[PDB]
mmCIF file of C-alpha atoms in Angstrom:
data_model
loop_
_atom_site.group_PDB
_atom_site.id
_atom_site.type_symbol
_atom_site.label_atom_id
_atom_site.label_comp_id
_atom_site.label_asym_id
_atom_site.label_seq_id
_atom_site.Cartn_x
_atom_site.Cartn_y
_atom_site.Cartn_z
ATOM 1 C CA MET A 1 13.296 -11.370 9.629
ATOM 2 C CA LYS A 2 10.113 -9.576 8.521
ATOM 3 C CA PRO A 3 11.009 -8.174 5.206
ATOM 4 C CA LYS A 4 8.788 -6.068 3.124
ATOM 5 C CA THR A 5 6.421 -8.738 2.081
ATOM 6 C CA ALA A 6 5.433 -8.574 -1.702
ATOM 7 C CA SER A 7 1.961 -9.485 -2.517
ATOM 8 C CA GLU A 8 2.477 -11.192 -5.713
ATOM 9 C CA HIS A 9 -0.540 -11.515 -7.615
ATOM 10 C CA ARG A 10 0.053 -12.754 -11.100
ATOM 11 C CA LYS A 11 -0.996 -10.500 -13.826
ATOM 12 C CA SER A 12 1.476 -10.199 -16.446
ATOM 13 C CA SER A 13 1.760 -8.243 -19.766
ATOM 14 C CA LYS A 14 5.075 -6.564 -20.140
ATOM 15 C CA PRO A 15 7.664 -8.215 -18.029
ATOM 16 C CA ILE A 16 9.709 -4.996 -17.841
ATOM 17 C CA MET A 17 6.603 -2.819 -17.204
ATOM 18 C CA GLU A 18 5.080 -4.921 -14.513
ATOM 19 C CA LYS A 19 8.504 -5.198 -12.870
ATOM 20 C CA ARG A 20 8.867 -1.417 -12.952
ATOM 21 C CA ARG A 21 5.242 -1.298 -11.521
ATOM 22 C CA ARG A 22 6.039 -3.826 -8.780
ATOM 23 C CA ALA A 23 9.185 -1.894 -7.774
ATOM 24 C CA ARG A 24 7.236 1.235 -7.587
ATOM 25 C CA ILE A 25 4.463 -0.537 -5.659
ATOM 26 C CA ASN A 26 6.997 -1.394 -3.052
ATOM 27 C CA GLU A 27 8.472 2.279 -3.239
ATOM 28 C CA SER A 28 5.152 3.853 -2.555
ATOM 29 C CA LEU A 29 3.915 1.411 -0.005
ATOM 30 C CA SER A 30 7.267 1.808 1.904
ATOM 31 C CA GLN A 31 7.136 5.685 2.147
ATOM 32 C CA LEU A 32 3.308 5.328 2.943
ATOM 33 C CA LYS A 33 3.945 3.121 6.000
ATOM 34 C CA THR A 34 6.869 5.502 6.942
ATOM 35 C CA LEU A 35 4.816 8.779 6.910
ATOM 36 C CA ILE A 36 1.831 7.231 8.421
ATOM 37 C CA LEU A 37 3.488 5.731 11.376
ATOM 38 C CA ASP A 38 5.434 8.972 11.846
ATOM 39 C CA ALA A 39 2.379 11.169 11.588
ATOM 40 C CA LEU A 40 0.341 9.268 14.237
ATOM 41 C CA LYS A 41 3.242 8.305 16.439
ATOM 42 C CA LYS A 42 1.709 5.035 17.539
ATOM 43 C CA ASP A 43 4.459 2.765 18.634
ATOM 44 C CA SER A 44 7.469 1.257 17.021
ATOM 45 C CA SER A 45 6.360 -2.243 18.098
ATOM 46 C CA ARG A 46 3.069 -1.865 16.376
ATOM 47 C CA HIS A 47 5.113 -0.727 13.400
ATOM 48 C CA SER A 48 7.058 -3.923 13.718
ATOM 49 C CA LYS A 49 3.770 -5.602 13.665
ATOM 50 C CA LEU A 50 2.223 -3.782 10.853
ATOM 51 C CA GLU A 51 0.241 -6.127 8.736
ATOM 52 C CA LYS A 52 -0.213 -5.126 5.017
ATOM 53 C CA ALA A 53 -3.878 -4.565 5.673
ATOM 54 C CA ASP A 54 -3.058 -2.596 8.806
ATOM 55 C CA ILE A 55 -0.750 -0.333 6.987
ATOM 56 C CA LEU A 56 -3.100 0.216 3.981
ATOM 57 C CA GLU A 57 -6.161 1.036 6.164
ATOM 58 C CA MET A 58 -4.042 3.036 8.575
ATOM 59 C CA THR A 59 -3.337 5.353 5.752
ATOM 60 C CA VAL A 60 -7.007 5.685 4.888
ATOM 61 C CA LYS A 61 -7.995 6.159 8.350
ATOM 62 C CA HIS A 62 -5.338 8.970 8.836
ATOM 63 C CA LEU A 63 -6.923 10.336 5.617
ATOM 64 C CA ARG A 64 -10.252 10.704 7.576
ATOM 65 C CA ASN A 65 -8.487 12.287 10.495
ATOM 66 C CA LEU A 66 -6.846 14.821 8.289
ATOM 67 C CA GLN A 67 -9.973 15.323 6.270
ATOM 68 C CA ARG A 68 -11.896 16.468 9.329
ATOM 69 C CA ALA A 69 -9.136 18.733 10.554
ATOM 70 C CA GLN A 70 -10.110 21.131 8.168
ATOM 71 C CA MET S 1 26.971 -19.475 -12.379
ATOM 72 C CA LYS S 2 23.494 -18.321 -11.887
ATOM 73 C CA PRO S 3 23.008 -17.443 -8.112
ATOM 74 C CA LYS S 4 19.723 -18.895 -7.038
ATOM 75 C CA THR S 5 18.715 -16.895 -4.201
ATOM 76 C CA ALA S 6 14.869 -16.425 -4.875
ATOM 77 C CA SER S 7 13.072 -19.388 -6.133
ATOM 78 C CA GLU S 8 11.366 -21.036 -3.081
ATOM 79 C CA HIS S 9 9.057 -19.107 -0.791
ATOM 80 C CA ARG S 10 10.654 -18.294 2.408
ATOM 81 C CA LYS S 11 7.414 -17.288 3.875
ATOM 82 C CA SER S 12 5.684 -18.192 7.087
ATOM 83 C CA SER S 13 2.193 -17.579 8.473
ATOM 84 C CA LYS S 14 -1.130 -19.239 8.783
ATOM 85 C CA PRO S 15 -3.061 -19.861 5.539
ATOM 86 C CA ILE S 16 -6.261 -18.866 7.174
ATOM 87 C CA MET S 17 -4.773 -15.683 8.784
ATOM 88 C CA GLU S 18 -2.964 -14.577 5.749
ATOM 89 C CA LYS S 19 -6.136 -15.254 3.781
ATOM 90 C CA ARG S 20 -8.052 -12.977 6.297
ATOM 91 C CA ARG S 21 -5.359 -10.422 6.009
ATOM 92 C CA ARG S 22 -5.427 -10.686 2.110
ATOM 93 C CA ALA S 23 -9.173 -9.800 2.153
ATOM 94 C CA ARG S 24 -8.463 -6.761 4.358
ATOM 95 C CA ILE S 25 -5.506 -5.629 2.061
ATOM 96 C CA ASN S 26 -7.878 -5.570 -0.947
ATOM 97 C CA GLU S 27 -10.554 -3.992 1.084
ATOM 98 C CA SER S 28 -8.278 -1.218 2.391
ATOM 99 C CA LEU S 29 -6.740 -0.620 -1.012
ATOM 100 C CA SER S 30 -10.146 -0.411 -2.713
ATOM 101 C CA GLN S 31 -11.391 2.352 -0.402
ATOM 102 C CA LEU S 32 -8.048 3.899 -0.420
ATOM 103 C CA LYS S 33 -8.097 4.611 -4.081
ATOM 104 C CA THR S 34 -11.801 5.633 -3.799
ATOM 105 C CA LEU S 35 -11.411 8.442 -1.223
ATOM 106 C CA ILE S 36 -8.228 9.666 -2.847
ATOM 107 C CA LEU S 37 -9.407 10.162 -6.426
ATOM 108 C CA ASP S 38 -12.675 11.487 -5.266
ATOM 109 C CA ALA S 39 -11.196 13.872 -2.846
ATOM 110 C CA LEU S 40 -9.097 15.756 -5.368
ATOM 111 C CA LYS S 41 -11.239 14.845 -8.443
ATOM 112 C CA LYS S 42 -8.539 14.026 -10.779
ATOM 113 C CA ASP S 43 -10.369 12.086 -13.279
ATOM 114 C CA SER S 44 -12.690 9.147 -12.971
ATOM 115 C CA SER S 45 -12.055 7.933 -16.372
ATOM 116 C CA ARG S 46 -8.306 7.395 -15.814
ATOM 117 C CA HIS S 47 -9.263 6.002 -12.441
ATOM 118 C CA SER S 48 -10.267 2.773 -14.274
ATOM 119 C CA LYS S 49 -6.517 2.436 -14.983
ATOM 120 C CA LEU S 50 -4.559 3.032 -12.045
ATOM 121 C CA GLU S 51 -1.413 1.098 -11.626
ATOM 122 C CA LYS S 52 -1.222 -0.278 -7.940
ATOM 123 C CA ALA S 53 1.830 1.767 -7.438
ATOM 124 C CA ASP S 54 0.024 4.923 -8.721
ATOM 125 C CA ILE S 55 -2.823 4.227 -6.179
ATOM 126 C CA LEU S 56 -0.530 3.778 -3.082
ATOM 127 C CA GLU S 57 1.458 7.073 -4.186
ATOM 128 C CA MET S 58 -1.531 9.083 -4.815
ATOM 129 C CA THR S 59 -2.687 8.276 -1.277
ATOM 130 C CA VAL S 60 0.731 9.195 0.081
ATOM 131 C CA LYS S 61 0.843 12.370 -1.986
ATOM 132 C CA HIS S 62 -2.506 13.521 -0.824
ATOM 133 C CA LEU S 63 -1.447 12.706 2.723
ATOM 134 C CA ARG S 64 1.365 15.337 2.184
ATOM 135 C CA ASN S 65 -1.271 17.778 0.966
ATOM 136 C CA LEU S 66 -3.368 17.371 3.937
ATOM 137 C CA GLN S 67 -0.338 17.683 6.201
ATOM 138 C CA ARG S 68 0.741 20.859 4.743
ATOM 139 C CA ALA S 69 -2.200 22.729 3.090
ATOM 140 C CA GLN S 70 -3.925 22.933 6.391
#
């Protein structure tokens, strides 16, 4: 399937804290993708083809759209 | 017992494409934190220490603001 890919870049310190961080990274990215795709209402297929980079920048680009809708 | 369910990488993609994606991930996330922190002007000092999760969330939360404050 295509699960929530975790971008594991190793930078350890506190095993517990970095895991909590990691979890929260997924938590935030998941809702990020969710509210973005829902606000723009692009397509569900291009949601099922959302590359991590596509998701991140989509959020930033929507930011610009909102930021001009003042 | 020890249930080994996650040890090997069940991960499939092209090394080159995923590397290109990786670059864009970092690119997107970088400008993402930038425009968010600067738009609300929280603190640029604490901006030197933003947890990845804090960064994603900060952007999502600002999305909400943009969606409902105007």
